[PDB]
C-alpha cells in the first residue's frame, strides 16, 4: 500500500513564499508523475504541476510565473514552492501520484491573511420546543471546537461553518433545539476551544 505524507507551513503572511513537501512511502519512484493540486474553500480542484525522476517540470500557465517544483531522490520526496502569494491562494493543498491519479496525500490547509492571531469572543443567543445558541465572533485563524454541557448535550446541535468577515477574522454560531420545559430545569452552557490562541470560553446561556 503506497502512502503519501505532506508537511509545510500553513499560515503565511501575504506577499511571501509558501513551501510544502511530500514524501512517498511504500511505493516505487519514477514512472509516476508527482503532481500538486489545490482546492479553494467551497470550490473545485486545480492542477498545479507534475514532476518525475528527473526535472520534468510541467506547470500550469495560470500560476507558472510563481510556481517551482523540485524533487529529492535520496529521500523519495518532492517539494512545491509558490512565490508572491495573496489571499486568493488560500486553499487545501494535496500531493498525488498521477499514474489517472490513484493515491493522494492527507492535504494541508494553507491560508493567506495579513491579520494576526486573536482569541474568540463568545456571546449568548438566548431563547425566548425552543432554540438557543452561542455566537463565536472575531477569531483568527480557524478552527474552533464548540461543545455543549462539556459533551453531555449532543442531540439537536448544529454548529455552522465560519465566515471570513471583511475585517479578516472568522465568526460562526452553534445552536441547539431543546424542549422549552427544560429552560428553567436544565442549564445550557457552550464550551468554545481555540487552539491557535490557546483559549477556552465557557458561556452560560440562560433565558433572557
Amino acid at each position: 500500500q503506497v502512502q503519501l505524507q505532506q508537511w509545510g507551513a500553513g499560515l503565511l503572511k501575504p506577499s511571501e513564499t509558501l513551501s510544502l513537501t511530500c514524501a512517498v512511502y511504500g511505493g516505487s519512484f519514477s514512472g509516476y508523475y508527482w503532481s500538486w493540486i489545490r482546492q479553494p474553500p467551497g470550490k473545485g480542484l486545480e492542477w498545479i504541476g507534475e514532476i518525475n525522476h528527473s526535472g520534468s517540470t510541467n506547470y500550469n500557465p495560470s500560476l507558472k510565473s510563481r510556481v517551482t517544483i523540485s524533487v529529492d531522490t535520496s529521500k523519495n520526496q518532492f517539494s512545491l514552492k509558490l512565490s508572491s502569494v495573496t489571499a486568493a491562494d488560500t486553499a487545501v493543498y494535496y500531493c498525488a501520484r498521477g499514474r489517472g491519479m490513484d493515491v493522494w496525500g492527507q492535504g494541508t490547509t494553507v491560508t493567506v491573511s495579513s491579520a494576526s492571531t486573536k482569541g474568540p469572543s463568545v456571546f449568548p443567543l438566548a431563547p425566548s420546543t425552543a432554540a438557543l445558541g452561542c455566537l463565536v465572533k472575531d477569531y483568527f485563524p480557524e478552527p474552533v471546537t464548540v461543545s455543549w454541557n462539556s459533551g453531555a448535550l449532543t442531540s439537536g446541535v448544529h454548529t455552522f461553518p465560519a465566515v471570513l468577515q471583511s475585517s479578516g477574522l472568522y465568526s460562526l454560531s452553534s445552536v441547539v433545539t431543546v424542549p422549552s420545559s427544560s429552560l428553567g430545569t436544565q442549564t445550557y452552557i457552550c464550551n468554545v476551544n481555540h487552539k491557535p490562541s490557546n483559549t477556552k470560553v465557557d458561556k452560560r446561556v440562560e433565558p433572557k
Binding site: 473545485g44 480542484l45 486545480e46 492542477w47 510541467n58 500550469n60 500557465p61 495560470s62 494535496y94 498521477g98 499514474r99 489517472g100 491519479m101 490513484d102 493522494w104 496525500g105 492527507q106 492535504g107 469572543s121 456571546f123 449568548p124 443567543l125 438566548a126 432554540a131 445558541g133 455566537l135 465572533k137 448544529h158 454548529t159 455552522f160 461553518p161 465560519a162 465566515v163 468577515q165 465568526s171 460562526l172 454560531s173 445552536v175 433545539t177 433572557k208
Partner: protein, 215 residues
C-alpha cells in the same frame, strides 16, 4: 484548450435508485483519457475510474463509466448511503494543463420539510463592545434552496448579512441555515423593528420572525 463540464450541479436521489452523472468536454477527448474522482467533506479525492470504464483497484462494482468524444457518463447502479459525495471528472493524458470538472454534488432525497425559523437579537454583552449581530436560524428543512431577507423598519437590507449552512444531517437528511446581520451600535440604536423573512418551498407563504429593540 479542453474544458470539462459536469451536470447537474446537484443530483438528489434516494438510496437504491440509480444515479447517472455527466461530463462534457470542449474538444474531442479519447475515452481512455478521462478519469473520475469521489471526494467527501474534509477528505482527499478517491479515484474511481481512470479510463472510460476502467474501475480502479478497490472500487465497488456498482460504479461504471461510458462515453465518447465529448459526452461521458459516470453511473452508480444502486446507490448506497456511503455514495453521497462530490464527484469530479478530469482530463488526463491529452493536453496540459490537465484540469478538472466543476463537480457534481450528490444529495439524499427526502420529503419536503419546512424550516423552523428563530431570531436572536444582540445580547447586552455584545452591545457594550460597539457592534451588534442579529442571528436568524432555519432548523431542519429540505430542500436546501431557500432565501432569507433582513428588514430594519421594513426596509430591505443588502450588503451587510452573511450566511452559513451545515452539511446534510446524517440523521434526518435535512439542512440548517444561519444568517448574521452585523451593524454598528449607532446604526443599531437608530431604528426599532428588526425582521427576518424566509422564503422556502415548504412554506405556503414567506414566514417572518421579528423583534423590537426594546420590548
Amino acid at each position: 484548450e479542453i474544458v470539462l463540464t459536469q451536470s447537474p450541479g446537484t443530483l438528489s436521489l434516494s438510496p437504491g435508485e440509480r444515479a447517472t452523472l455527466s461530463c462534457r468536454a470542449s474538444q474531442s477527448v479519447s475515452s481512455s483519457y478521462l478519469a473520475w474522482y469521489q471526494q467527501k467533506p474534509g477528505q482527499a479525492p478517491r479515484l474511481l475510474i481512470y479510463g472510460a470504464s476502467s474501475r480502479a483497484t478497490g472500487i465497488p462494482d456498482r460504479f461504471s463509466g461510458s462515453g465518447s468524444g465529448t459526452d461521458f457518463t459516470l453511473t452508480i447502479s444502486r446507490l448506497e448511503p456511503e455514495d453521497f459525495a462530490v464527484y469530479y471528472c478530469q482530463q488526463y493524458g491529452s493536453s496540459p494543463p490537465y484540469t478538472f470538472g466543476q463537480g457534481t454534488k450528490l444529495e439524499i432525497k427526502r420529503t419536503v420539510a419546512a424550516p423552523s425559523v428563530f431570531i436572536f437579537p444582540p445580547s447586552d454583552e455584545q452591545l457594550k463592545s460597539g457592534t451588534a449581530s442579529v442571528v436568524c436560524l432555519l432548523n431542519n428543512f429540505y430542500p436546501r434552496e431557500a432565501k432569507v431577507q433582513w428588514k430594519v423598519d421594513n426596509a430591505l437590507q443588502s450588503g451587510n448579512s452573511q450566511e452559513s449552512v451545515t452539511e446534510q444531517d446524517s440523521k434526518d437528511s435535512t439542512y440548517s441555515l444561519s444568517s448574521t446581520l452585523t451593524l454598528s451600535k449607532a446604526d443599531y440604536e437608530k431604528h426599532k423593528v428588526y425582521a427576518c423573512e424566509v422564503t422556502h418551498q415548504g412554506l405556503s407563504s414567506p414566514v417572518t420572525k421579528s423583534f423590537n429593540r426594546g420590548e
